[PDB]
Amino acid sequence: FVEMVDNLRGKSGQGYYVEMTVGSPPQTLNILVDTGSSNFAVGAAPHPFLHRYYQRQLSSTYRDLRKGVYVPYTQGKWEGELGTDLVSIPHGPNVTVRANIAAITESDKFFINGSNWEGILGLAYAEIARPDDSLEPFFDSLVKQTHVPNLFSLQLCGAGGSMIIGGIDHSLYTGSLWYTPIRREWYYEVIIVRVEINGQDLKMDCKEYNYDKSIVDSGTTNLRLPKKVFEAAVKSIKAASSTEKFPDGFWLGEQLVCWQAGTTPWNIFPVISLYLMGEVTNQSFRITILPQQYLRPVEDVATSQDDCYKFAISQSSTGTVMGAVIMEGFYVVFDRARKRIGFAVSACHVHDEFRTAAVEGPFVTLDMEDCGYN
Numbered sequence: 001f002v003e004m005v006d007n008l009r010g011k012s013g014q015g016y017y018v019e020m021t022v023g024s025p026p027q028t029l030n031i032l033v034d035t036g037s038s039n040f041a042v043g044a045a046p047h048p049f050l051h052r053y054y055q056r057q058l059s060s061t062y063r064d065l066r067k068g069v070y071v072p073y074t075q076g077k078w079e080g081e082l083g084t085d086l087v088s089i090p091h092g093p094n095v096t097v098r099a100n101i102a103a104i105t106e107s108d109k110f111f112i113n114g115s116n117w118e119g120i121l122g123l124a125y126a127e128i129a130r131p132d133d134s135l136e137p138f139f140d141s142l143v144k145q146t147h148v149p150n151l152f153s154l155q156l157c158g159a160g161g162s163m164i165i166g167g168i169d170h171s172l173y174t175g176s177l178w179y180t181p182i183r184r185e186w187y188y189e190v191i192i193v194r195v196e197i198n199g200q201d202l203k204m205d206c207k208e209y210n211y212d213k214s215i216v217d218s219g220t221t222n223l224r225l226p227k228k229v230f231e232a233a234v235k236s237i238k239a240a241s242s243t244e245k246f247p248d249g250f251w252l253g254e255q256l257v258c259w260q261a262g263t264t265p266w267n268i269f270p271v272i273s274l275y276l277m278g279e280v281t282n283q284s285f286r287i288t289i290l291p292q293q294y295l296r297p298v299e300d301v302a303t304s305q306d307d308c309y310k311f312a313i314s315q316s317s318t319g320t321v322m323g324a325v326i327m328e329g330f331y332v333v334f335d336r337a338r339k340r341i342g343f344a345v346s347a348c349h350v351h352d353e354f355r356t357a358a359v360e361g362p363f364v365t366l367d368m369e370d371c372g373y374n
């Protein structure tokens with residue numbers, strides 16, 4: 001795991017990527033690590049934003065599955081050809097697997113102009129794979145064909161990171177790991193059973209927090225909350241920070257807020273605690289997020305020279321998404337073998353002058369199942 005430490009590059013803004021090699025002889029690509037999707041899909045044609053792409057026909061081990069795939073989003077898509085090839089992770093375990101690969105032949109609003117990655121490693125489960133759940137996701141192939149344990153953990157830093165494949169590295173976190181159950185193997189779905197701001201219960205029905213699901217998603221920048229929860233949260237963060245006025249635009253992620261370099265008044269901004277369903281009946285634990293995780297610094301803007309931040313909490317269309325902004329505070333263990341997700345304070349988390357992040361428990365929370373939306 002020493003050899004996997006620091007094997008990710010990038011930021012929460014454009015995502016985190018891992019080097020992979022596909023085919024024979026090996027072709028080296030940077031691949032977004034995305035726990036909110038389940039396809040392994042790589043640029044396979046010279047889209048102008050791409051540094052590198054997959055040239056199937058130069059791989060002696062490529063096998064055309066003679067089947068297309070099509071994945072749409074709200075305002076875009078990617079599209080391509082399914083096949084299999086030999087895959088590896090230079091700074092991963094010392095194995096080669098034959099995996100399903102979607103050779104992206106055409107796409108729209110998918111690749112980010114200026115990014116240094118060319119594909120997507122969908123680490124979530126087969127149920128949300130495209131074109132259907134019979135397209136075995138990458139991690140499933142890795143585990144089936146090798147003795148690599150069926151887990152991985154992510155330490156996302158910035159504001160790069162590490163993906164430890166096959167276990168847990170003690171040196172990437174402090175304190176103890178607490179585990180929340182994966183509710184259904186599709187997205188990494190979890191249950192938020194309670195939310196607090198500076199220790200103050202947000203006081204809503206916990207079904208609101210998971211309406212219609214809550215997921216851990218390294219392919220999303222922000223903490224995203226459902227509409228009602230988002231409004232409750234912002235009102236409360238306004239209240240804790242009412243000694244200053246901010247434009248409405250700020251709370252909508254449209255405008256920055258700046259202070260004289262070094263004078264950002266962090267104390268004004270509250271810690272958010274999300275309680276997660278525990279492994280034991282009526283037991284939960286809490287993860288504590290600090291303002292320096294949801295106030296994301298904004299660098300050279302037009303031409304900026306102060307200290308400036310945008311609000312990295314946003315409204316959710318499809319439930320609570322624990323994006324990179326949240327994951328960046330923690331070492332997140334995706335224990336697929338035991339249907340569970342572990343959190344511990346990250347060794348690389350941004351500290352704050354007077355407050356320290358935490359993962360802690362146990363708490364008693366009755367009727368936690370009822371926080372699940374059905």
Ligand SMILES: COc1cncc(-c2cccc(CNc3cccnc3N)c2)c1
Pocket residue numbers: 011012013014015016032034035036037110111120217218219220221324
């Ligand atoms: C922080 O990770 C990202 C930041 N910016 C863009 C992406 C990105 C780009 C293209 C496709 C995808 C697919 N995955 C999504 C998309 C939307 C929401 N969640 C996920 N997992 C991500 C990831």
